Amino acid sequence: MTHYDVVVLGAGPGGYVAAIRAAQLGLSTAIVEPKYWGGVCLNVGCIPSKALLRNAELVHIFTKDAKAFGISGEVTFDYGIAYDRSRKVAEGRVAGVHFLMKKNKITEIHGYGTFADANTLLVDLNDGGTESVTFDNAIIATGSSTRLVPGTSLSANVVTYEEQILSRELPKSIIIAGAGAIGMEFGYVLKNYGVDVTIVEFLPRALPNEDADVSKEIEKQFKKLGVTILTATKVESIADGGSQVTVTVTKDGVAQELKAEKVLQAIGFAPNVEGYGLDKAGVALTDRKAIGVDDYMRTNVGHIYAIGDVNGLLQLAHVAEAQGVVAAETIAGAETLTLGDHRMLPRATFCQPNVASFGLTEQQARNEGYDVVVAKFPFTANAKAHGVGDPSGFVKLVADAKHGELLGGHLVGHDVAELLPELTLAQRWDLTASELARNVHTHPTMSEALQECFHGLVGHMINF
Amino acid sequence: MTHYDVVVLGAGPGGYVAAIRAAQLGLSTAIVEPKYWGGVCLNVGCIPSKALLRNAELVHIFTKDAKAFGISGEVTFDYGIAYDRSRKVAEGRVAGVHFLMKKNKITEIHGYGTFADANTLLVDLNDGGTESVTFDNAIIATGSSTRLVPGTSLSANVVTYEEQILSRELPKSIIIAGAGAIGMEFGYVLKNYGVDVTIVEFLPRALPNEDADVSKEIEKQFKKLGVTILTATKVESIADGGSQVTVTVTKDGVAQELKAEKVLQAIGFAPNVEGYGLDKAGVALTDRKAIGVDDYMRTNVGHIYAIGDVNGLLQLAHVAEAQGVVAAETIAGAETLTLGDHRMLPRATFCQPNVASFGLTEQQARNEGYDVVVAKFPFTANAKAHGVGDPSGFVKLVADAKHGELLGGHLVGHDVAELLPELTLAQRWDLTASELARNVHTHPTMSEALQECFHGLVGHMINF
Ligand SMILES: Cc1cc2nc3c(=O)[nH]c(=O)nc-3n(C[C@H](O)[C@H](O)[C@H](O)COP(=O)(O)OP(=O)(O)OC[C@H]3O[C@@H](n4cnc5c(N)ncnc54)[C@H](O)[C@@H]3O)c2cc1C
Ligand SMILES: Cc1cc2nc3c(=O)[nH]c(=O)nc-3n(C[C@H](O)[C@H](O)[C@H](O)COP(=O)(O)OP(=O)(O)OC[C@H]3O[C@@H](n4cnc5c(N)ncnc54)[C@H](O)[C@@H]3O)c2cc1C
Ligand SMILES: CC(=O)Nc1cccc(NC(=O)CN(C)S(=O)(=O)c2cc(C)cc(C(F)F)c2)c1
Ligand SMILES: CC(=O)Nc1cccc(NC(=O)CN(C)S(=O)(=O)c2cc(C)cc(C(F)F)c2)c1
Known part of the structure; x- marks a missing residue:
C-alpha cells in the first residue's frame, strides 16, 4: 500500500508527460501501465504510422513522378522493409519514454490498475502479483479503443488499426470503414504499396471534420491516386467469409455488396471507461461515455483528473500531452493556462x-x-x-x-x-x-x- | 514626356512588389526593366535553384537511403531533365509577374533606365529608341552583381551562378569559391549529380554568418556527402588553362594549387550602382558602395528610395519585397512599419x-x-x-x-x-x-x- 503524491493511470503521451511534469514540480509520482509505454501513439499509432507514410510517399515519388524528375530504371519496393523500419522506429521511441521515466525518478508500475475507492488503486501486476497503492491525486490517462460498426465483430480478416499496423504482409484488396484521418492514412499507405483500396464514409465528404473545401481537394487527390471513396454510404454489415470479406452498404437508398480480402474498421474511438473501477472512485461520465472534466482536467472528484483520449475532447497526442501538463500544474498549485475551446x-x-x-x-x-x-x-x-x-x-x-x-x-x-x-x-x-x-x-x-x-x-x- | 506618380527601376522581387503595392495605394506606376521580369530570383536565382535542389535531394534519397527504405533497382538520374524542369518552373513564374503587372494596371517599360536629373528618367528601349519619363517618386530596385575574386576574370571555365545555373551539362570536377548559401547549394546539387566538388572559404567556417554550432553541423553533413570544404583558406589566383583551371589558395602562409574542370565564383554580391546616372539624380552611396537609405528606404534625395539588394542591407528576396512595401506605403502616406534591425x-x-x-x-x-x-x-x-x-x-x-x-x-x-x-x-x-x-x-x-x-x-x- 505504498503512497505517492500522484499516481498516473496509463503511460501514453498524456500519462507519461503528466508524470514528467508532476516530477519536475517536486511531486512523488508513480505511473501504472500493463502494455504500452508511450501508449497507442508510440507503439501502434502516430510514430509507426508516420514512418510507414514516409515510405509510401517515396514509393509515390519514385513511381508516379520518376520521369518528371529524370529518374529512370526499374524500381521495386518491399513493404516488409517499411514494416521493419516502422517497428524499429517505434521501439527506439519507447526506449526513450523509459529513459525519461528514470531521468525524472518516476516509479514505473508494470500492471493494470483498478480503483478500490477515491484514494486507492489495486494493481494486477504483469508478474502475476497484486498490489495496492494510495495517492493524494490521480491522473486518469487510459486512452480510447476502436469503435466497431454496430452489429459487426473482429475476426481474421476484419481488423482494427492495431492488427493492420502490426502486419508485415499486405492483402490484395481492402475495404476501410471510415474516412477520417486514420482511414485516409492507411488508404494512402496501402494504395501506394499496390493494394486495391475502397474507403466507405457515412457522411457526404471524406475528412468530414475538415472545411468542405479541404474535403473536396483531398477527395480529388485520392481519386488521382486510384483510391475509391464512397461517401454518403452506410456500412450495414460485415461478413468474414475466410477467402473474402463481404461488406453490405446502403448508398442512394440501395443496398449493395462490396468484396475485399480484408476490412479495416476505423469509424472512431470510444474512451476506455469500463472495467477498472471508475464507479468505486466516484468518477462521473458524460452522456457520450467520456470522463467529464472541467478546464483544469478535474473530474467531479476534486483530486482525480482525466487527460487524453479518455475525456473525448480532441483525441490527439499533443492534446493529451498539453492536458497532462495542465493537470500536473493544477495539482502542484503552479501557474498554468487552460486550453479553452478545444x-x-x-x-x-x-x-x-x-x-x-x-x-x-x-x-x-x-x-x-x-x-x-x-x-x-x-x-x-x-x-x-x-x-x-x-x-x-x-x-x-x-x-x-x-x-x-x-x-x-x-x-x-x-x-x-x-x-x-x-x-x-x-x-x-x-x-x-x-x-x-x-x-x-x-x-x-x-x-x-x-x-x-x-x-x-x-x-x-x-x-x- | 509621360509622367507617373511612381517609377520603379528594376523588376526583381523588390521592384515588382513595390509597384504592386504602389498601385494598390492608388499611385500611377510604371516599372522599367530590360531583361529579367522577376529579376535574378525568378529567372536565375531562388526559383530555379530550389527546383534543382529538390532534384538533387531525390538523388540523395535513392543513392544513400534506398536500401533502408526497401527500394531496389538500378536507377540512373539525368541532370538534363533537372535542368529542363528548373527552366519550365522559372518561365511559369515570370509569366506570373507579367500577369500581376497587368492585373494591377502597372505600365511595363521594356528597356534600361538612366537618371537625367532627380525627376527624369531616360529609357533606352529594347525595341530601339529612347523615351523620357518624369516622376514624382522613384524606387531604385536595380539589384546586385557577382563580386569576383580580385584580379580574376570570367571565361569558358570560370563562371558565376548565372552561367552555371543555365548549364544543362555538368563538369567532372569544380572548385567553388565561397561557402555562403549559394556556394553551398550549388555544391550540394553538383555533388549529388556526381561532380567532384571542393569549396574554398576565406573565413574559418562554412556558412560563416550562421551560429557556429550550425556551421559545425553543416560542415559535418557535407563531409559525409563527400564535398571537400577548405575553410580559413584564401583564393589568390584563378588561371583558366582551357583543359583545366588552376586555383592557387593559401592557408597559414602555405600555398597550394587546386585543379578542376571548372570554377564557380560565389564570394559575394556588389550592389549595382554604376552606369545609370545616380550622380545626375544626386543619390549618395555608402562607403561599401551600396545606395544609402534610412529606415523608410529613402535615399538622401527625399523622393528617391532604394530597395532590395542595391542597398546591401540583407540581400534576400523576401527582404527586397518587404522593403518595397515600406517604400510604397511611405510614398503614399499609408500606415507602415519599418523593418528595424535587419x-x-x-x-x-x-x-x-x-x-x-x-x-x-x-x-x-x-x-x-x-x-x-x-x-x-x-x-x-x-x-x-x-x-x-x-x-x-x-x-x-x-x-x-x-x-x-x-x-x-x-x-x-x-x-x-x-x-x-x-x-x-x-x-x-x-x-x-x-x-x-x-x-x-x-x-x-x-x-x-x-x-x-x-x-x-x-x-x-x-x-x-
Ligand atoms: C493508427 C493511429 C495513428 C495515429 N496518429 C496520430 C497522429 O499522427 N497525431 C496525433 O496527435 N494522434 C494520433 N493518433 C492518436 C493518438 O494515438 C492518441 O491521441 C494518443 O495515443 C492518446 O494518448 P493517451 O495518453 O490519451 O492514450 P493512449 O496512448 O491510448 O494510452 C493509454 C494507455 O493507458 C493504458 N491503460 C488503460 N487502462 C489502464 C488501466 N486500468 N491501468 C493501467 N493502464 C491502463 C493502456 O494500456 C494504454 O497504453 C493516432 C492513433 C492511431 C490509432
Ligand atoms: C543562385 C541564387 C539563388 C538565390 N536563392 C535565394 C533564395 O533561396 N532566397 C532568397 O531570398 N534570395 C535568394 N537569392 C537572392 C535573390 O535572388 C535576391 O536577393 C533578389 O533577386 C533581390 O531582388 P531585387 O529586386 O533587389 O533585385 P534583382 O532580382 O537583382 O533584380 C534587379 C533587376 O534590376 C534590373 N536593372 C538593373 N539596373 C537597371 C536599370 N538601370 N534600369 C532598369 N532595370 C535595371 C536588372 O535587369 C534586374 O532584373 C538567390 C540569388 C542567387 C544568385
Ligand atoms: C538528455 C537526453 O539524452 N534525453 C533523451 C534521451 C533519449 C530519448 C529522449 N526523448 C525521446 O525519445 C522523445 N520521445 C519519447 S518521442 O517519441 O520522440 C516524442 C514523443 C512525443 C509525444 C512528443 C515528442 C516531441 F518532443 F517531439 C517526442 C530524450
Ligand atoms: C488572381 C490570379 O489569378 N493571380 C495569379 C495568376 C498567376 C500567377 C500568380 N502569381 C505568381 O505566379 C507568384 N509568383 C510571381 S512566384 O514566383 O510564385 C512568387 C514570387 C515571390 C517573390 C514570392 C511569392 C510568394 F507568394 F510565395 C511567389 C497570380
Whole structure:
C-alpha cells in the first residue's frame, strides 16, 4: 500500500508527460501501465504510422513522378522493409519514454490498475502479483479503443488499426470503414504499396471534420491516386467469409455488396471507461461515455483528473500531452493556462498532400454568427511548391471582420502540417491579421502562402 | 514626356512588389526593366535553384537511403531533365509577374533606365529608341552583381551562378569559391549529380554568418556527402588553362594549387550602382558602395528610395519585397512599419539538411551584453524526424533572461526553413518564451522541437 503524491493511470503521451511534469514540480509520482509505454501513439499509432507514410510517399515519388524528375530504371519496393523500419522506429521511441521515466525518478508500475475507492488503486501486476497503492491525486490517462460498426465483430480478416499496423504482409484488396484521418492514412499507405483500396464514409465528404473545401481537394487527390471513396454510404454489415470479406452498404437508398480480402474498421474511438473501477472512485461520465472534466482536467472528484483520449475532447497526442501538463500544474498549485475551446487546437493528417487545420471551418464560423472574412491562396502561386514538384492545394484562413482576429485555418498541400504554429500562436495571444501580415516570411517557402493570406484578410494579396 | 506618380527601376522581387503595392495605394506606376521580369530570383536565382535542389535531394534519397527504405533497382538520374524542369518552373513564374503587372494596371517599360536629373528618367528601349519619363517618386530596385575574386576574370571555365545555373551539362570536377548559401547549394546539387566538388572559404567556417554550432553541423553533413570544404583558406589566383583551371589558395602562409574542370565564383554580391546616372539624380552611396537609405528606404534625395539588394542591407528576396512595401506605403502616406534591425529578419539555405535562422547568434548576443539563455533540442528526440528518416540537426534558441524575449533562433535539419514564422512573429510583437511554451504544436511534426526549446528557455524540457 505504498503512497505517492500522484499516481498516473496509463503511460501514453498524456500519462507519461503528466508524470514528467508532476516530477519536475517536486511531486512523488508513480505511473501504472500493463502494455504500452508511450501508449497507442508510440507503439501502434502516430510514430509507426508516420514512418510507414514516409515510405509510401517515396514509393509515390519514385513511381508516379520518376520521369518528371529524370529518374529512370526499374524500381521495386518491399513493404516488409517499411514494416521493419516502422517497428524499429517505434521501439527506439519507447526506449526513450523509459529513459525519461528514470531521468525524472518516476516509479514505473508494470500492471493494470483498478480503483478500490477515491484514494486507492489495486494493481494486477504483469508478474502475476497484486498490489495496492494510495495517492493524494490521480491522473486518469487510459486512452480510447476502436469503435466497431454496430452489429459487426473482429475476426481474421476484419481488423482494427492495431492488427493492420502490426502486419508485415499486405492483402490484395481492402475495404476501410471510415474516412477520417486514420482511414485516409492507411488508404494512402496501402494504395501506394499496390493494394486495391475502397474507403466507405457515412457522411457526404471524406475528412468530414475538415472545411468542405479541404474535403473536396483531398477527395480529388485520392481519386488521382486510384483510391475509391464512397461517401454518403452506410456500412450495414460485415461478413468474414475466410477467402473474402463481404461488406453490405446502403448508398442512394440501395443496398449493395462490396468484396475485399480484408476490412479495416476505423469509424472512431470510444474512451476506455469500463472495467477498472471508475464507479468505486466516484468518477462521473458524460452522456457520450467520456470522463467529464472541467478546464483544469478535474473530474467531479476534486483530486482525480482525466487527460487524453479518455475525456473525448480532441483525441490527439499533443492534446493529451498539453492536458497532462495542465493537470500536473493544477495539482502542484503552479501557474498554468487552460486550453479553452478545444476546437481552436491544431490537428493534421499525414497523407500527401497533408491536411492541417485549427479552429472553425468557414461554414461553422458563419453558422455561429461571426462577421466572416475569408482569404484563400493556392500553392500554384507559390514558388517553393513548384520547385518541390507539388503545387496542389491551398491555404484558407477564416477571420472575424471586427478586428481581423483568426477564427480558423485550413491547409492542404505538401508538408503543410509544419505551418500551423504561427497561426495558433496569433489566435491564442490575440494577434490579428494586421500584425500577422507584417511578419516577413522567408522566400521561397510554403509558409509564404500564410503571409499572402494575411494580406488578403487585411486588404489585397500581392503575389496573387 | 509621360509622367507617373511612381517609377520603379528594376523588376526583381523588390521592384515588382513595390509597384504592386504602389498601385494598390492608388499611385500611377510604371516599372522599367530590360531583361529579367522577376529579376535574378525568378529567372536565375531562388526559383530555379530550389527546383534543382529538390532534384538533387531525390538523388540523395535513392543513392544513400534506398536500401533502408526497401527500394531496389538500378536507377540512373539525368541532370538534363533537372535542368529542363528548373527552366519550365522559372518561365511559369515570370509569366506570373507579367500577369500581376497587368492585373494591377502597372505600365511595363521594356528597356534600361538612366537618371537625367532627380525627376527624369531616360529609357533606352529594347525595341530601339529612347523615351523620357518624369516622376514624382522613384524606387531604385536595380539589384546586385557577382563580386569576383580580385584580379580574376570570367571565361569558358570560370563562371558565376548565372552561367552555371543555365548549364544543362555538368563538369567532372569544380572548385567553388565561397561557402555562403549559394556556394553551398550549388555544391550540394553538383555533388549529388556526381561532380567532384571542393569549396574554398576565406573565413574559418562554412556558412560563416550562421551560429557556429550550425556551421559545425553543416560542415559535418557535407563531409559525409563527400564535398571537400577548405575553410580559413584564401583564393589568390584563378588561371583558366582551357583543359583545366588552376586555383592557387593559401592557408597559414602555405600555398597550394587546386585543379578542376571548372570554377564557380560565389564570394559575394556588389550592389549595382554604376552606369545609370545616380550622380545626375544626386543619390549618395555608402562607403561599401551600396545606395544609402534610412529606415523608410529613402535615399538622401527625399523622393528617391532604394530597395532590395542595391542597398546591401540583407540581400534576400523576401527582404527586397518587404522593403518595397515600406517604400510604397511611405510614398503614399499609408500606415507602415519599418523593418528595424535587419539582423532579426529570417533567412534559410536549402541544401539538405536545411539551415534556417533569424536574429543574433549566441556569441553575438553575448558580445552585445544580453543576459543570454540558450535552449537546444536535437532532432534525435523528435518522433517525426525519425519517421522521415533524418533525425540529424537541432533547434537552438537564444533568449534574454529578464523576460525570456527571443534574440535569435538557429535551426539545422530536415525542411526546417518552414519553421521560422512563429519565432519571428513572437520576436516582432513581444511574445516571450513563456507565451510561446503554451502554444500547442501538432504531433508528430518537426515543429514540436520549437515547443521543447520554449520549455527549456522557461524551465525544463519535457521530452528531452
Ligand atoms: C493508427 C493511429 C495513428 C495515429 N496518429 C496520430 C497522429 O499522427 N497525431 C496525433 O496527435 N494522434 C494520433 N493518433 C492518436 C493518438 O494515438 C492518441 O491521441 C494518443 O495515443 C492518446 O494518448 P493517451 O495518453 O490519451 O492514450 P493512449 O496512448 O491510448 O494510452 C493509454 C494507455 O493507458 C493504458 N491503460 C488503460 N487502462 C489502464 C488501466 N486500468 N491501468 C493501467 N493502464 C491502463 C493502456 O494500456 C494504454 O497504453 C493516432 C492513433 C492511431 C490509432
Ligand atoms: C543562385 C541564387 C539563388 C538565390 N536563392 C535565394 C533564395 O533561396 N532566397 C532568397 O531570398 N534570395 C535568394 N537569392 C537572392 C535573390 O535572388 C535576391 O536577393 C533578389 O533577386 C533581390 O531582388 P531585387 O529586386 O533587389 O533585385 P534583382 O532580382 O537583382 O533584380 C534587379 C533587376 O534590376 C534590373 N536593372 C538593373 N539596373 C537597371 C536599370 N538601370 N534600369 C532598369 N532595370 C535595371 C536588372 O535587369 C534586374 O532584373 C538567390 C540569388 C542567387 C544568385
Ligand atoms: C538528455 C537526453 O539524452 N534525453 C533523451 C534521451 C533519449 C530519448 C529522449 N526523448 C525521446 O525519445 C522523445 N520521445 C519519447 S518521442 O517519441 O520522440 C516524442 C514523443 C512525443 C509525444 C512528443 C515528442 C516531441 F518532443 F517531439 C517526442 C530524450
Ligand atoms: C488572381 C490570379 O489569378 N493571380 C495569379 C495568376 C498567376 C500567377 C500568380 N502569381 C505568381 O505566379 C507568384 N509568383 C510571381 S512566384 O514566383 O510564385 C512568387 C514570387 C515571390 C517573390 C514570392 C511569392 C510568394 F507568394 F510565395 C511567389 C497570380
